[PDB]
Nucleic acid binder design. Structure first.
Ligand SMILES: [Zn+2]
Lengths: 362, 94, 83, 96, 108, 107, 93, 81, 96
DNA sequence: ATCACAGGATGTATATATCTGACACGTGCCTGGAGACTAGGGAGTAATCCCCTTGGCGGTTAAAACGCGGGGGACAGCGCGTACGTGCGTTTAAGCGGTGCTAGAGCTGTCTACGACCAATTGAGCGGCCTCGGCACCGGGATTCTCCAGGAT
DNA sequence: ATCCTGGAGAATCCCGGTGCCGAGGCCGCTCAATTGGTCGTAGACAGCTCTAGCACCGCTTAAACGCACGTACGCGCTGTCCCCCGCGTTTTAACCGCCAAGGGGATTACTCCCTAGTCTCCAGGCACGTGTCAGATATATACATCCTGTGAT
């Protein structure tokens, strides 16, 4: 079952040999924006999260779609859980003698996601008009996760996420998360938890409206670290004797969902599903299968099939726990409707029974 | 072989609320004990004086509150007042 | 009932006389402004404590003792106004 | 046009002001400054005349002592003229 | 007799109340100690304790540690202007100093 | 019934003893105050009192007076290193300052 | 009501040193502030010494020690000499 | 015991100076520095002795040193208190 | 024969000594200094090892603080090198 | 003659593996916290008395504010030379650890001189009163300062 | 440009008298000191345990000591300039004395109720014991900063 998958993986990799220039264009725009933000009193401390890189591709089948995060330090914050959601919080500031320059975004006691996002978009919009060799257009808002979507010439899109950084003990809701103890080790878990966590502007939306000024917890940096340090051996994959298919399985899982979403993007059934769900499911399967020998590259076929099966089980039962926040169900009926899950279930089951033809067809 | 009192046990607990995953050295603990006794004495000392100055035999929550304001700077004093005011408000309501 | 800008009530000659008493012979023009910026801080810290004592006692009028206690605890003491 | 040179009067005044004991800051001006500051903490405050005097003497004593240290800093720099930074240094060393 | 309950728990405090109630009596701070005094104070001591430990913990994390040592207490206290002053005359065993180098001493 | 007799007389002091005893036992210094403590203290306060007044009286004559004023107390204290130190943080109302002029300021 | 002060005792001491010297009301007010300031300090340290050594009673010994900790140079010494005598005599009186 | 002030080595002085941000040290500093340290120690030690003797002890404890330092406007943390 | 220029090492050392927390004065030397001073007040006196350490830490903290103020005075005088005067001025301003 | 660059040299930060002893957690007391109770003194409240702070007026007077001219100090720039910094090689005694001794801290138990406490008596000290004497102020004169001109260096 | 009288011109000291209000002494009285007796417990004292502070020994080795080179720094000297000082004239509001109003501090009398002090009982917290993980140590590799030559400009 691995041979067809290997051909797919090779195809997906080769499509990225062309990117070096695209990454260049993204960098040009990003550096430009950061200069303006640094000139702005509110964003003076802003910088890239994925330090050393101007590109990250969240979607495996979208090589022309870039994702960058602009982080902003908040030296001390008090979180207040929004409506028992375990992932959404109001951000307030603690006692701080010196002037805190983010005061301009406050609304009463609470840091306004709306104000910060509004100004973030404002600064960028005025600033992109100062990009002269490259045409950069700001797209209309569709949410707060990407604070800004930029359209660069006719080839490049950049999703920009603004995040607050907090270098303090992770919230209690994360206490039982990051369940890598039996996979990457308990000591690695502890090391990772000495790192900061992030907060992204995000309204806490419900069926009857939304809470405007909430922020959601983000551990994207840890997710990256795990994927690139997925072994308990660590140099797993730096040598053939330890070549595993974890990374391959994730690309294929992401690719399966992305291909199906692309296939049916017009019927809208799959709009609420994302690579983050796939990636979360993947980490759970890795947790269930902590030994590198359960991911032998030779078993790509069955490893991927088993990954698919787990994802299907999550869809059918409407349950996918956030890897860092176990009480946060990414697949709750409140976030994703059953119709979408039944549709995806059937499409995946069709694909799996036919050796995943959607992988070749476009 | 004498029971010796300290705040080591209480300091640990506070540490857990602010930083659940961290510990503290025996020296840092010794320092925190010196710290608590220093602040305690000052507040109790000033509260004593306020009671004396205003011709009283009793220290109440006010002498403590006023003592806090005089001893602590800026907002630090304020938050201490807010927390104290509350703890009493609740204590007498519980 | 609102007071303002009485910081300039501390006149140039007044500053100089204080400086001269301290043995200062010659004074740069920028001293007058800088000096007031220090006097004021001193007064804010002392007055505030005096008010704090006054409020504790539930009074309105600040007395000499309220001032003396206020000064005392700041690393000094003043003799001749009570005790 | 008979007159004294620069520095002759200044030394003289140093002698005289060191010698006398009265207040050098005018009273009503000072008194108002105290109140202007006080009103920022609370309105409708009142002062006894003895409270105002207590504040004034402490205030002058403070400034005079500050000037003594300021003067030394200027001398250390090999000068006669005191500048804002001689004041700042003196305070910083004191720990203010 | 009714079941006994700790007062610290009742007031929502971690610091001992009964003990403070007692200590406030000695050195003869006053002939008498009011019922709400021990509580008010315990809350204050706890608040300040938390501020120092939290900031020190942050320093410990910056240095990639899992605990507070005397040095972290020093860095936290001094960087925080209000705590700096409250303890402005305190010498911390093994505190070290802040890495402040005067600009005029640096070449360029 | 023995006649009442001032303790100050017994101790050869001018300062009150019974009063000092009273002040010591309250003002919250201790639960108890020993009989000899008030006496020891009264003698100390008296000694220091004499030193200041004696020196101030001398200062009064430098100004050719027969009286002590706040200024004479200031001059008495600051021209005596030990008293100056004991009272080094004391501001004395209407004390003025010593007539000290730095040599570098002079012709 | 009726205030209390040391004005009467200070006045007498002045006569012991300078029989023909008078004193202003302010100088007297200053001397009163002085006496109360020194009293408080010695009493303060004596309180502490008793506490430090886990005792309830202040005796002439705590006062003596307190004097030394507070007074500089020989003032501490001459004060101790005088204190010692006053107690020695009072006891034998 | 005698002249143990010379036990405070030159490097020891410089290192303290460096920690204070001192970049260059005049050759006459070493003696001047000692003349200050010694005075500091005399005042602190003497108070510690005074407390020790009052208590009728011969061994000076950390608590006697702490009390001695404290009253000079110097609370020291980490040795009881 | 590679060399660093004057001031390069000195700045390096400043960084490091500011960073570390250990005692900079040798112990046995310091310990004896304490005792020599102590014997001038009283013979046959003893110390706990913790008493000696308490003195040493306080002593260094004092000197470091003194050097910081000394350094500022030298800068005020537009110098890099600290001289005995800079120590004396700082102490005086502080009330010593 | 100056800029910057590249190379070397050096020192720092980095990941790695192993060691150990200092923390974190568990057990078993045991004595201080908490509950329950009475007794009575301090703090709270309101009456109300009258002292002192506030506000306002008008006159006068010294003190501030303003402007001008000119000397004198602050400052920048230059050059001398020496007093520190840096690196090398030799000497020192600090630090480690291990041993052995006993002086003095720390705790126990007994007993009694000392001080809190209370009730009675009274005279030392505080408030209010008058008296007049040392000090502050006025005006005049003596002499002791500073500063410039003119004649020496 | 700098030293030495000798005069002119203020400023500061000393002299003698006015007059005033603040100190100093006297009287009433009242309540805080003194006395005298009782109770109980804090502190003095002796005895004993055994921790921990002193003294000594030898070995390892990182710090301290002393010297030589040379150059960045401190110091003194010069000249520019501008910015304070000192004086005189005009303008302001501080100070003084007097007046009236009333707000709030100080004292009084009275009453609970909120605490101290007592006894009983149990669980929260400290001293000890044990196991293993965090940080220290040490090894080795790779990146960053500093300082001379040197060739390009
Ligand atoms: Zn792998």
């Amino acid at each position: 079952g691995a041979s067809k998958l290997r051909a797919v993986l090779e195809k997906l990799k080769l499509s990225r040999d062309d990117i070096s220039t695209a990454a260049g264009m993204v960098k040009g725009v990003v550096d430009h924006l950061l200069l303006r933000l640094k000139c702005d009193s509110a964003f003076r401390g802003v910088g890239l999260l994925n330090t050393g890189s101007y590109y990250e591709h969240v979607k495996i089948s979208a090589p022309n779609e870039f994702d960058v995060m602009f982080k902003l330090e908040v030296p001390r914050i008090q979180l207040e859980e929004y409506s028992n959601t375990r992932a959404y919080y109001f951000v307030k500031f603690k006692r701080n003698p010196k002037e805190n320059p983010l005061s301009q975004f406050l609304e009463g006691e609470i840091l306004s996601a709306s104000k910060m996002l509004s100004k973030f978009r404002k600064i960028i919009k005025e600033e992109i008009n100062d990009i002269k060799d490259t045409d950069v257009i700001m797209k209309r808002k569709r949410g707060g996760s990407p604070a800004v979507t930029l359209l660069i010439s006719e080839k490049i899109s950049v999703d920009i996420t603004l995040a607050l950084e907090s270098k303090s003990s992770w919230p209690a809701s994360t206490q039982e998360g990051l369940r890598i103890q039996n996979w990457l080790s308990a000591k690695v878990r502890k090391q990772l938890r000495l790192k900061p966590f992030y907060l992204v502007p995000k309204h806490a939306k419900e069926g009857n409206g939304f809470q405007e000024e909430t922020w959601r917890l983000s551990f994207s940096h840890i997710e990256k670290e795990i994927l690139n340090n997925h072994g308990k051996s660590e140099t797993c994959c730096e040598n053939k004797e330890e070549k595993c298919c974890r990374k391959d399985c994730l690309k294929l899982m992401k690719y399966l969902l992305e291909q199906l979403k692309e296939r049916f993007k017009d019927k809208k059934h799959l709009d609420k599903f994302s690579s983050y769900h796939v990636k979360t499911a993947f980490f759970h399967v890795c947790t269930q299968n902590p030994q590198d020998s359960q991911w032998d590259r030779k078993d790509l076929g069955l490893c991927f099939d088993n990954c698919v099966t787990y994802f299907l089980q999550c869809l059918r039962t409407e349950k996918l726990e956030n890897y860092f926040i176990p009480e946060f169900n990414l697949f709750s009926s409140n976030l994703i409707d059953k119709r979408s899950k039944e549709f995806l279930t059937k499409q995946i089951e069709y694909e799996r029974n036919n050796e995943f033809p959607v992988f070749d067809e476009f | 072989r004498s029971r010796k009192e300290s705040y080591s046990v209480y300091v640990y607990k506070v540490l857990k609320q602010v930083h659940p995953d961290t510990g503290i050295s025996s020296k840092a603990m010794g320092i925190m004990n010196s710290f608590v006794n220093d602040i305690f004495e000052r507040i109790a000392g000033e509260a004593s004086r306020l009671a004396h100055y205003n011709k009283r035999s009793t220290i109440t929550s006010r002498e403590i509150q006023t003592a806090v304001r005089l001893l602590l700077p800026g907002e630090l004093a304020k938050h201490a007042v807010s927390e104290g005011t509350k703890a009493v408000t609740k204590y007498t309501s519980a | 009932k609102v007071l303002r800008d009485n910081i300039q009530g501390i006149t140039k000659p007044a500053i100089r006389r204080l400086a001269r008493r301290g043995g200062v012979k010659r004074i740069s023009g920028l001293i007058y402004e800088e000096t007031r910026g220090v006097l004021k801080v001193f007064l804010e810290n002392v007055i505030r404590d005096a008010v704090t004592y006054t409020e504790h006692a539930k009074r309105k009028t600040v007395t000499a003792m309220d001032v003396v206690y206020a000064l005392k605890r700041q690393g000094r003491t003043l003799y001749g106004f009570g005790g | 046009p008979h007159r004294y040179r620069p520095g002759t009067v200044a030394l003289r005044e140093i002698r005289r002001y060191q010698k006398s004991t009265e207040l050098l800051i005018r009273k009503l001006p000072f008194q108002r400054l105290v109140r202007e500051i006080a009103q920022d903490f609370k309105t409708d405050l009142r002062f006894q005349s003895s409270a105002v005097m207590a504040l004034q003497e402490a205030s002058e004593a403070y400034l005079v002592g500050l000037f003594e240290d300021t003067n030394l800093a200027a001398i250390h720099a090999k000068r006669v003229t005191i500048m804002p930074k001689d004041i700042q240094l003196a305070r910083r060393i004191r720990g203010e | 007799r009714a079941k006994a309950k700790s007062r610290s728990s009742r007031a929502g405090l971690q610091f001992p109340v009964g003990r403070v109630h007692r200590l406030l009596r000695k050195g003869n701070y006053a002939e008498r100690v009011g019922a709400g005094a021990p509580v008010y104070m315990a809350a204050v001591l706890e608040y300040l304790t938390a501020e120092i430990l939290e900031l020190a913990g942050n320093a410990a994390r910056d240095n990639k540690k899992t605990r507070i040592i005397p040095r972290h207490l020093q860095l936290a206290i001094r960087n925080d202007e209000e705590l700096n002053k409250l303890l402005g005359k305190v010498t911390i065993a093994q505190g070290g100093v802040l890495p402040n180098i005067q600009a005029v001493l640096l070449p360029k």
